[PDB]
């Protein structure tokens, strides 16, 4: 199994180091919005 | 609340018919159906006694 007489390994291992931290972002979300509608107006008694 | 009051006043405002009535008390008293009398006669009587 390729060890020393004392049992120490004779090969150096590797691990393929994990790939960095991860950055997370947020965004503003807008939805369709409407406006008010108008109704017929009354006739007051006073002048303009 | 004041704005609501003003709005209801404006929406229910109306120009009123302006009428005049002339009421002569002597004629009104004489024309009474049940309990009538004469204004001048009764006044003169109540003044003399």
PDB file of C-alpha atoms in Angstrom:
ATOM      1  CA  UNK A   1       0.000   0.000   0.000  1.00  0.00           C
ATOM      2  CA  UNK A   2       3.003   2.297  -0.547  1.00  0.00           C
ATOM      3  CA  UNK A   3       3.613   3.341   3.059  1.00  0.00           C
ATOM      4  CA  UNK A   4       6.886   3.746   4.914  1.00  0.00           C
ATOM      5  CA  UNK A   5       8.189   1.117   7.326  1.00  0.00           C
ATOM      6  CA  UNK A   6       6.703   3.301  10.076  1.00  0.00           C
ATOM      7  CA  UNK A   7       3.354   3.538   8.262  1.00  0.00           C
ATOM      8  CA  UNK A   8       3.625   7.129   7.045  1.00  0.00           C
ATOM      9  CA  UNK A   9       2.132   7.668   3.569  1.00  0.00           C
ATOM     10  CA  UNK A  10       4.527   8.274   0.692  1.00  0.00           C
ATOM     11  CA  UNK A  11       2.143  10.415  -1.405  1.00  0.00           C
ATOM     12  CA  UNK A  12       0.774  13.907  -0.828  1.00  0.00           C
ATOM     13  CA  UNK A  13      -2.989  14.227  -1.195  1.00  0.00           C
ATOM     14  CA  UNK A  14      -5.103  17.010  -2.717  1.00  0.00           C
ATOM     15  CA  UNK A  15      -8.647  18.217  -2.132  1.00  0.00           C
ATOM     16  CA  UNK A  16      -9.691  20.639  -4.944  1.00  0.00           C
ATOM     17  CA  UNK A  17     -10.364  23.569  -2.578  1.00  0.00           C
ATOM     18  CA  UNK A  18     -14.004  24.745  -2.447  1.00  0.00           C
ATOM     19  CA  UNK A  19     -14.934  27.521  -4.862  1.00  0.00           C
ATOM     20  CA  UNK A  20     -15.021  30.871  -2.954  1.00  0.00           C
ATOM     21  CA  UNK A  21     -17.938  32.505  -1.092  1.00  0.00           C
ATOM     22  CA  UNK A  22     -21.195  33.390  -2.852  1.00  0.00           C
ATOM     23  CA  UNK A  23     -22.603  36.905  -3.181  1.00  0.00           C
ATOM     24  CA  UNK A  24     -26.379  37.349  -3.022  1.00  0.00           C
ATOM     25  CA  UNK A  25     -28.254  40.378  -4.346  1.00  0.00           C
ATOM     26  CA  UNK A  26     -31.736  41.865  -4.084  1.00  0.00           C
ATOM     27  CA  UNK A  27     -33.719  43.991  -6.518  1.00  0.00           C
ATOM     28  CA  UNK A  28     -36.718  46.294  -6.617  1.00  0.00           C
ATOM     29  CA  UNK A  29     -39.822  44.714  -8.138  1.00  0.00           C
ATOM     30  CA  UNK A  30     -42.503  46.976  -9.605  1.00  0.00           C
ATOM     31  CA  UNK A  31     -46.014  45.983 -10.642  1.00  0.00           C
ATOM     32  CA  UNK A  32     -48.536  47.576 -12.969  1.00  0.00           C
ATOM     33  CA  UNK A  33     -50.514  50.323 -11.230  1.00  0.00           C
ATOM     34  CA  UNK A  34     -53.591  52.201 -12.391  1.00  0.00           C
ATOM     35  CA  UNK A  35     -55.099  55.601 -11.725  1.00  0.00           C
ATOM     36  CA  UNK A  36     -58.452  56.953 -10.645  1.00  0.00           C
ATOM     37  CA  UNK A  37     -61.375  57.530 -12.995  1.00  0.00           C
ATOM     38  CA  UNK A  38     -63.611  60.599 -13.195  1.00  0.00           C
ATOM     39  CA  UNK A  39     -67.385  60.885 -12.833  1.00  0.00           C
ATOM     40  CA  UNK A  40     -69.805  63.468 -14.248  1.00  0.00           C
ATOM     41  CA  UNK A  41     -69.901  66.588 -12.114  1.00  0.00           C
ATOM     42  CA  UNK A  42     -72.842  68.363 -10.528  1.00  0.00           C
ATOM     43  CA  UNK A  43     -74.034  71.891 -11.306  1.00  0.00           C
ATOM     44  CA  UNK A  44     -73.548  74.160  -8.308  1.00  0.00           C
ATOM     45  CA  UNK A  45     -75.570  77.305  -7.692  1.00  0.00           C
ATOM     46  CA  UNK A  46     -72.653  79.768  -7.590  1.00  0.00           C
ATOM     47  CA  UNK A  47     -70.772  81.400 -10.434  1.00  0.00           C
ATOM     48  CA  UNK A  48     -67.300  80.260 -11.448  1.00  0.00           C
TER      49      UNK A  48
ATOM     50  CA  UNK B   1     -66.023  66.744   8.758  1.00  0.00           C
ATOM     51  CA  UNK B   2     -66.205  70.436   7.825  1.00  0.00           C
ATOM     52  CA  UNK B   3     -65.424  69.599   4.194  1.00  0.00           C
ATOM     53  CA  UNK B   4     -68.226  67.022   4.182  1.00  0.00           C
ATOM     54  CA  UNK B   5     -70.602  69.618   5.641  1.00  0.00           C
ATOM     55  CA  UNK B   6     -69.643  72.152   2.966  1.00  0.00           C
ATOM     56  CA  UNK B   7     -70.055  69.566   0.203  1.00  0.00           C
ATOM     57  CA  UNK B   8     -73.533  68.563   1.357  1.00  0.00           C
ATOM     58  CA  UNK B   9     -74.487  72.242   1.630  1.00  0.00           C
ATOM     59  CA  UNK B  10     -73.337  72.932  -1.928  1.00  0.00           C
ATOM     60  CA  UNK B  11     -75.009  69.842  -3.385  1.00  0.00           C
ATOM     61  CA  UNK B  12     -78.341  70.467  -1.630  1.00  0.00           C
ATOM     62  CA  UNK B  13     -78.407  74.261  -1.961  1.00  0.00           C
ATOM     63  CA  UNK B  14     -81.485  75.643  -3.697  1.00  0.00           C
ATOM     64  CA  UNK B  15     -82.712  79.087  -4.692  1.00  0.00           C
ATOM     65  CA  UNK B  16     -86.057  79.431  -2.929  1.00  0.00           C
ATOM     66  CA  UNK B  17     -89.223  81.014  -4.266  1.00  0.00           C
ATOM     67  CA  UNK B  18     -89.698  84.360  -2.511  1.00  0.00           C
ATOM     68  CA  UNK B  19     -93.355  85.097  -1.753  1.00  0.00           C
ATOM     69  CA  UNK B  20     -95.084  87.969   0.043  1.00  0.00           C
ATOM     70  CA  UNK B  21     -98.397  87.772   1.906  1.00  0.00           C
ATOM     71  CA  UNK B  22    -100.391  90.729   3.214  1.00  0.00           C
ATOM     72  CA  UNK B  23    -102.695  89.826   6.109  1.00  0.00           C
ATOM     73  CA  UNK B  24    -105.148  92.461   7.328  1.00  0.00           C
ATOM     74  CA  UNK B  25    -106.065  91.502  10.879  1.00  0.00           C
ATOM     75  CA  UNK B  26    -109.560  93.008  10.689  1.00  0.00           C
ATOM     76  CA  UNK B  27    -110.429  90.927   7.621  1.00  0.00           C
ATOM     77  CA  UNK B  28    -108.785  87.838   9.126  1.00  0.00           C
ATOM     78  CA  UNK B  29    -110.787  88.150  12.351  1.00  0.00           C
ATOM     79  CA  UNK B  30    -114.053  88.823  10.515  1.00  0.00           C
ATOM     80  CA  UNK B  31    -113.560  85.883   8.128  1.00  0.00           C
ATOM     81  CA  UNK B  32    -112.973  83.379  10.943  1.00  0.00           C
ATOM     82  CA  UNK B  33    -115.376  80.460  10.685  1.00  0.00           C
ATOM     83  CA  UNK B  34    -116.312  79.596  14.281  1.00  0.00           C
ATOM     84  CA  UNK B  35    -115.019  82.285  16.673  1.00  0.00           C
ATOM     85  CA  UNK B  36    -115.075  85.614  14.829  1.00  0.00           C
ATOM     86  CA  UNK B  37    -115.545  89.241  15.859  1.00  0.00           C
ATOM     87  CA  UNK B  38    -114.972  92.811  14.674  1.00  0.00           C
ATOM     88  CA  UNK B  39    -111.534  94.286  15.332  1.00  0.00           C
ATOM     89  CA  UNK B  40    -112.511  97.967  15.408  1.00  0.00           C
ATOM     90  CA  UNK B  41    -115.638  97.438  17.513  1.00  0.00           C
ATOM     91  CA  UNK B  42    -113.893  95.186  20.027  1.00  0.00           C
ATOM     92  CA  UNK B  43    -110.900  97.531  20.317  1.00  0.00           C
ATOM     93  CA  UNK B  44    -113.121 100.571  20.880  1.00  0.00           C
ATOM     94  CA  UNK B  45    -115.201  98.663  23.439  1.00  0.00           C
ATOM     95  CA  UNK B  46    -112.144  97.416  25.338  1.00  0.00           C
ATOM     96  CA  UNK B  47    -110.756 100.952  25.373  1.00  0.00           C
ATOM     97  CA  UNK B  48    -113.980 102.601  26.558  1.00  0.00           C
ATOM     98  CA  UNK B  49    -114.286  99.998  29.344  1.00  0.00           C
TER      99      UNK B  49
END
